[PDB]
Write a protein that binds this DNA or RNA. Structure first.
Ligand SMILES: [Mg+2]
Lengths: 93, 93
DNA sequence: CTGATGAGTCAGCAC
DNA sequence: GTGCTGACTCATCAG
């Protein structure tokens, strides 16, 4: 067990490992402490959520880039399959 | 004691001059709470607009890769026009 | 001050 | 219990 645990601790340990440093604490101290855990936990979930949110937009911007890369040479490749196909028709005379 | 009680919608939509009339009578402390509640309410909106703007800009990114996946297609098919213009006019030179 | 936005808290849903 | 995310509050910054 030990004494009072810090944030970087309560949130890291397992659920049973908590019932351990939990022995001997009024009915309220029992919940209120598991609460401070959940709260600390949510705080972290929020942090992933913020990141995720960004890294997902990152991906669209990345695809977007590339899926414009192709439709750039596909507009120029087809511009060339018309410039030389036009000289294979004028040669016809 | 004293005070006349408004509603969120009212207080937020209310205008600066209306607000100032609704102030007459209100104890100083009462003014403070009121002005703060208004701000909190205002932030609520800013936050809402903010959430929106995120959605807005996210669809917009897709509804743009939606114009690049459908544009790499109107050009992948204009790429089918080459089979006829490089096989039917290139067996003549 | 007004508007915007990261961080954190909270409820509510999903597994 | 765990993880996630919408809505909200708060601090804090540009304009
Ligand atoms: Mg709250």
């Amino acid at each position: 067990m030990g004494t009072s645990l810090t944030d970087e601790e309560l949130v890291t340990m397992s659920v049973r490992e908590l019932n351990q440093h939990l022995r001997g604490l009024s009915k309220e101290e029992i919940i209120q402490l598991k609460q401070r855990r959940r709260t600390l936990k949510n705080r972290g979930y929020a942090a992933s959520c913020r990141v995720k949110r960004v890294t997902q937009k990152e991906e669209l911007e990345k695809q977007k880039a590339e899926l414009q890369q192709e439709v750039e040479k596909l507009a120029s490749e087809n511009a060339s399959m018309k410039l030389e196909l036009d000289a294979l028709r004028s040669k016809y005379e």
